[PDB]
RNA sequence: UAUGCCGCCCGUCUUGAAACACGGACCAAGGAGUCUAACGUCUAUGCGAGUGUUUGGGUGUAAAACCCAUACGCGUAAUGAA
RNA sequence: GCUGUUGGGACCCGAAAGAUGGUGAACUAUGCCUGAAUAGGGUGAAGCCAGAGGAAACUCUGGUGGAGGCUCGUAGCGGUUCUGACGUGCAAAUCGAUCGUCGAAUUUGGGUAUAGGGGCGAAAGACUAAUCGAACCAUCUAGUAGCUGGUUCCUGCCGAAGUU
RNA sequence: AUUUUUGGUAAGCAGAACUGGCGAUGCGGGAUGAACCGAACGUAGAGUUAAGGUGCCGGAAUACACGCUCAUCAGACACCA
RNA sequence: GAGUAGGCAGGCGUGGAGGUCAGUGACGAAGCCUAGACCGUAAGGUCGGGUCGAACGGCCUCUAGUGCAGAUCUUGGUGGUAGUAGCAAAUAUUCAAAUGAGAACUUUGAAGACUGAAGUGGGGAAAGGUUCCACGUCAACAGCAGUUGGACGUGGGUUAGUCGAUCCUAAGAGAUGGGGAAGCUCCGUUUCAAAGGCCUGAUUUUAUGCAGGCCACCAUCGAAAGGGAAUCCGGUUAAGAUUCCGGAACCUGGAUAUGGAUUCUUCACGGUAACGUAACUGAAUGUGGAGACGUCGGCGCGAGCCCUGGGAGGAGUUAUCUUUUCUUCUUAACAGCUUAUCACCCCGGAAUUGGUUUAUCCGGAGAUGGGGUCUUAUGGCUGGAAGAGGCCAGCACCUUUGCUGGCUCCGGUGCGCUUGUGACGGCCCGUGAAAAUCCACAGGAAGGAAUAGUUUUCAUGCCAGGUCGUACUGAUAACCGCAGCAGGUCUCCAAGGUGAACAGCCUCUAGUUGAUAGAAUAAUGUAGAUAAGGGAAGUCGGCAAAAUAGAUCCGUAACUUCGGGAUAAGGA
RNA sequence: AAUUACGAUCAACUUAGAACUGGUACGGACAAGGGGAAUCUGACUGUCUAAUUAAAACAUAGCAUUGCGAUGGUCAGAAAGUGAUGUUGACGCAAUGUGAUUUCUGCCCAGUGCUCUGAAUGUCAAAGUGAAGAAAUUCAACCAAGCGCGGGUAAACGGCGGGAGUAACUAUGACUCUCUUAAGGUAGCCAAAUGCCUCGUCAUCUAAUUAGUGACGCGCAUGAAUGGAUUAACGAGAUUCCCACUGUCCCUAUCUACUAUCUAGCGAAACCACAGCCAAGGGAACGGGCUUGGCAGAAUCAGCGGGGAAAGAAGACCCUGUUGAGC
RNA sequence: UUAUAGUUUCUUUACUUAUUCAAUGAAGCGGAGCUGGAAUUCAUUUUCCACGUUCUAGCAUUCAAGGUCCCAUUCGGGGCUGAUCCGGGUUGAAGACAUUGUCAGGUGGGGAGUUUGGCUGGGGCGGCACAUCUGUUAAACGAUAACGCAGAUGUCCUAAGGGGGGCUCAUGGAGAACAGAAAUCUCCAGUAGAACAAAAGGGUAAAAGCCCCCUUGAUUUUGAUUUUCAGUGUGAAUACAAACCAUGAAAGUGUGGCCUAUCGAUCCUUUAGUCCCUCGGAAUUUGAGGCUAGAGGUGCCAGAAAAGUUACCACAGGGAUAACUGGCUUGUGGCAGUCAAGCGUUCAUAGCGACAUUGCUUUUUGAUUCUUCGAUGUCGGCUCUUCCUAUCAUACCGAAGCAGAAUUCGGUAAGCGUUGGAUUGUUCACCCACUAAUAGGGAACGUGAGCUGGGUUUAGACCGUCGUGAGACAGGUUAGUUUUACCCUACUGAUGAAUGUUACCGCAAUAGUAAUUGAACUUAGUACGAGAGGAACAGUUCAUUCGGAUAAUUGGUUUUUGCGGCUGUCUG
């Protein structure tokens, strides 16, 4: 048999990322001595769109405290941010929308958003559009806070991991219908070469596990093991449950 | 050449081919049981309880011919797993 | 020395295959980069302007505007039917009429990436240089064949088997 | 293929027994035919016959003898139509 | 005395080998040809005749790549079919002369035609590679012909500071440090690296040591359509020209001396202001702009073309008519002075809400109104530049060249066509490259005066611009398709009429008139057509064809997701 | 200074309106929709079998499910100081299914599969542990994961036909039992592209209909995102009927051009054992040749498609082969 | 008992330094000290308590202030602060876990390799005819086949083996309380009609059977022999011999079952035997290996280790073998007789016909596998010719339960014709309608270089059922390339040398041949008939189907491009 779609495109051949119209990695500027001991001013200098993702990145120029520069930063833009603003990123750093803050230093009850995974990670969590974390709970005595995503997993994450004040602006961009298939085709030709998807069950066998048959059926289980090799998983993988539930998922 | 009578197209597989079975338009040339190691039978030749010079040495008119020691193979004893 | 046996290309010619190591994206497939290309019409979306009606709630009219993976149709791109032409052709896929579509999921040049149990696939096992249910080149290789075909002078003598 | 013989409605079908043939076989005859009849074959001459025939084709009695048959679908040589 | 499969024996023939016949042979070996002969049951042998020209044989033995009709055998050659099929799509040729041995095909003239500016026009890209052009020539090729040619023979021809390449980066490809791998080499391109360059004077030790000091996540390749320093006109050759010549520019790199401008505390002044003027210091470093960008719909402007008027020339028609049919009347880069939407500035203080677009936006973060500032795209005039080019007339000139003079002017118009563009607006879960390069500012390092010095962002002046490509076709004959193949192959410019129109049909400019021809008009075909009456009875099936059709007015159903259906239908 | 709705001038083409006129002609050539009533099906535009299939297949938006919070998920690499997603972060990335909108999406974890805040020891490898021995070694308990056991799960694969009798009356909706493991096909729909019988039966369309449509349903073998029932618009899709139209036909005819034909020139190929008259006979059971008859006269031209079991290609169907390949 | 600190022995935590994951251009880490403002126990040597920037889209870069030495006080350049000291651990996670290495268990069609019996009236589905046994086939020795017939085996038995001894079995008859058809008892007959483990056959009467007594010949050693047969194996059997036993008074009999079936190689493992041999430098004991006889098994039974699928398919082959024709056959189908019980008022036969029975045909379907697998183009329709007659109509006849008309049954007879449509691809079928009638057939199931391509049967696709699945379906549905004649013959037409030349006019061998059917008027409302209905020959007039001509007339056709008209454009 064949190697399949979903086996090939881990090559990274055709299924790269389109990376030219886009304006950089958005971060969080380095976690350095003026943001662990007060904060430095930014002036949100302007607000972009970029390609492939859905949400305003903002251009936030800071200085550079050891040379004479003007070091420009590349943020994801909270909604109710605007130009000319200014951020205020660190540890003293007041609790506006925009202003980047470690967890440790903040209130339970917080919306945050381009939270640290670790300290100096430079932003992870709660990086797409209209999405947040809660942060829940704290713990100063090995100074760990309890965060919810937007999952609506718990987490624990360091006292001293950022996270950035308010939503991600572009919310409510699901709930509008995508449209006529152009409107995906365009979707995801600045993101990457997913699109349109063949079913496994309507190719040959060589192409798919799913393949062959006088009818278009999958013929058996498609739950597949945890397991199962790399080249076997077409279907649901380690599926725990299936079917459609009843009152509250 | 005429005349009387006779005479299906060869090769092939086939129980059975003139075959409505296969190859063959025609011609020239090329074109298919070989060599080798090891053996069975039968026969010729040598020597014959022996036999085999030629791996090697000596020699040479020089890949020839001629000469030759010690082994070695087989035979001269079989039967037993031993 | 004839005959015979076995291993060797083993009387000669013949597979579909398999293995090793290499060469292809000048065709077509998909993505990316950087370019280019597409008359004239129909219908008349939001926004906007002026009217009329009614106690009010609110409802009707005319114009404007110029939307649409809208629509007719040219170039273009395609290939439905004629099961037309041709079918030892103009051509190893063309010709003619008829037709699909024609501002986008469009058409397309150059550059660039993906290489064979691999690619690529809006999925037909499709396409990957007229080659694809596993490309092409060389080698292993004179592959093997209980199967087909062939197997070259004369005369003389003898003369079978299809059964255990 | 005659004879014995199983299956089968049957078969130029399938399968046996003994023998003889074709295969591997020309020749004379049954018009023609692998198998039937007669005979098996170096090259010739002469003579005589086999099976089969002797109106004409066609070598050979339109021979002899006793009967039968007249068909507007005569009949005519075994295997064999 | 038969005989397949098969066995065995006796011989026939071939390439070589040892021996022998003191073999044959240029007075003719071998080979081949022979309705001549003889021997042999046969395989075969022997002889005569011819052709030919250099070797070959009998016999006794040795040895083998040793004997052919078949293998859809191999290679090479040859046939019958057969002078047959055929050489029939791109509308089409015809008369005369010339040339020549020879003309349907060549050259010229004259007709008649076609392509019809989405072309059979004029350039190019990739590809080819001399096909371009001249002379000589026709054995081969151009499926007829050939005097012709993209053929054949010999030559000639491609000129660049400005066009490209060269440079920059794009998707990417890739050394390096390193790490993997038995190894071929694989990963990665800023990484767990000690990863060199920049300028000022210095100080004049035949020119070498300083420091003002700074600055550093770092090869290279990657576009003849992206980014990009700078060129235009006229003429010129058999064939090249944005290159040659003539005239005029411009850019970059470097040198420098005058003119200017600035300078009594020196780095200019003016305007309230937007900003202006010929200049009018400015290191490190930092900052910002340009390079730099979608797509569409209408709208304003510009250039070119199209239509059109008067006048100055020439040509065509003229039995009749026509103040008319045709045609020339053109202005480059570059330099100047000027020129505008937009934006901005001052005065002013708006509701009785005004200004205003095709499109409804704008105003107390200051409208309207009055007056100003700028971008110079774009136009105007001028210089270029009339001497050029064009259209003429008169005169000669053996050749080959001329000489002389004249006109080259003034309009108008627009939902026109192409095209550049400016300000807007619709669209997006799509918001539509980067780098080289250049500039500007912030900044204030350093330097600099008046009886002599500053400044090269301005004016003039001087010098240099290498390397490679450059001809030609770009296709119904130059590229790929075995070919001179009805196929395929990326673009640019684009006239008149009809008409909604770049549709179809006809013409102008320019280009071809090439696709074997002649004769005759049977069958059957192929591509076009028409048919009385009936009208799907044909047929698997209304396949094929017929009918309908543009525009204006009238009218428009079920159903509906209320957008549609819709050009419904049905009429005039 | 006395104070209106007005002149001069130049200039395009748009639509109205009337008259006149013709062999009732006028989008005069060119150009240029046939339309209507239904069913099946896919919502639509889009895409593919280059060279026999353009479709009802693929895609699609919508819907649903599954995995994953990075010391991760899916995937790559012989390896690695390696990589794709990812210049990414759940409104994301990855993996499936169904296929617009409307309406709904039933029941079944017995089986296969997937998963787990589930329980022991039922197994339970190597290494380790202990016993025996002179050692090699044999024997024992301890034994990780997973299996096994227990739960969860069907928009996971799938299944859901269930099957009998009694009873008003004349065909039975009340009783009764046993369930194929778990449930017994619910709402719906149909001789449907799914119905064998089947040309089902009834109606309708026709003079006549194995067709069409609308109903009926113990449905050989319909059915709920392996989606079921609708459904406007759309379709070079499949089908039926009607009107217009016609050489499709009754029934053919005629015309044009280019062929064919003849000529000059140039000039192939396929195929070919030898060849080319029949009838019967026998025969590898369908002869050009054989036997017996019929017969039979040079050279041939244009047509033709009876025959040459004509040509194209070592049947692709079927079998065999101790031959392979995709799956 | 613990009080030595002499190892992890096992489990609960902790340490950084290996390993690990990040990030920065390795800037601010850690500890302490200042200033805190303060903690109040109280101004401290006590321990809790921060360390310069926030309304605003500006700016922040070249060490300035004080202080100290040099510059002889020019020029400025330098020390420390400004900005706290010390440790040089860049920062932070993670940590002896993970990572990686090796080995081990699980999962692992993601992937690789390979397999997927045989016989067979084609394969497959069945079956076992594949190893065996009885009877029959089997043709009186033996041997003998088929998917021939009726059956049987993969066991069972310490007695159902061995010996000996007593008795007689099936069944019937006559009889004895309960007791009867059947419980037990007695006698008489009783050639086996019983019994002997099974299948069947053979065998057996003081036994081989039934009852009783004792045993283990169902033992040891190896050889020869018979059946199958190669005179191999295996199995079974026979007869001795040499040992040891059993029984019996003994003769004797006994090496499993009364006889004919009841079973299995090498390699491997395991057991029995034997003071055995070997382990090769020499000893011993384990251990292993040998020697002789068993057992664990191959049922495909002389003994591979093995699941599907292909409608995407492939190669070598095969007419040894299927799907079509043809050939023998004729069951089956179709047609036709003989006999005649009877049906038909009566009446066998006008017309039919039971029970039987003899055929003929090759338009069905089978049976078979002879031809073809280096292909004979595989259904139906369209077209077209010819033939068969088993006659639907027509011609002329005979018969009748024939009055007429109508119909039925036959004869000669294939000359003559035998249709138009609806649905279906269909052949077949079924309806409507006209006709004189709408008979049946053949000719490679006529006819594809004649067409068509609906069906069938390649590849795409959908549904149902089946399959875990790939896939399957002679189930349904939709889309799906139909190639070549120019050769010979045949056929149709067209020439033609030679009969001294040429011309005209003829004859006729042979071949062909063609006409067809209906209606109407009259006969005639006549015959016939109770009536109702209702003929026929003769005499006319027209039609259908066919054929051969012909073009006056009618219609069709138009390149007569004959005339006229009309549109677009070009020729002023």
Request: cysteine-free; glycine content about 14%.
């Amino acid at each position: 048999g064949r190697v399949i779609r979903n086996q090939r495109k881990g090559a990274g051949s055709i299924f790269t990322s389109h990376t030219r119209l886009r304006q950089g990695a958005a971060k969080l500027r380095t976690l350095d001595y003026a943001e662990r001991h007060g904060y430095i001013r930014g002036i949100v200098k302007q607000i972009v769109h970029d390609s492939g993702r859905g949400a305003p990145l903002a251009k936030v120029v800071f200085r550079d405290p050891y040379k004479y520069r003007l070091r420009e930063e590349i943020f994801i833009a909270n909604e109710g941010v605007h130009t000319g603003q200014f951020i205020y990123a660190g540890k003293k750093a007041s609790l506006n929308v925009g202003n980047v803050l470690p967890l440790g230093s903040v209130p339970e009850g917080t919306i945050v958003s381009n939270v640290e995974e670790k300290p100096g990670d430079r932003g992870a969590l709660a990086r797409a559009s209209g999405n947040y974390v809660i942060i829940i709970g704290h713990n100063p005595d090995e100074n760990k806070t309890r965060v919810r995503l937007p999952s609506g997993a718990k987490k624990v994450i360091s006292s001293d991991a950022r996270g950035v004040i308010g939503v991600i602006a572009g919310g409510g961009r699901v709930d509008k219908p995508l449209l006529k298939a152009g409107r995906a085709f365009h979707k995801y030709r600045l993101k990457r070469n997913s699109w349109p998807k063949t079913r496994g069950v309507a190719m040959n066998p060589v192409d798919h596990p799913h393949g062959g048959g006088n009818h278009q059926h999958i013929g058996k289980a498609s739950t597949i093991s945890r397991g199962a090799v790399s080249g076997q998983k077409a279907g649901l993988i380690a599926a725990r449950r299936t079917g459609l539930l009843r009152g509250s998922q």
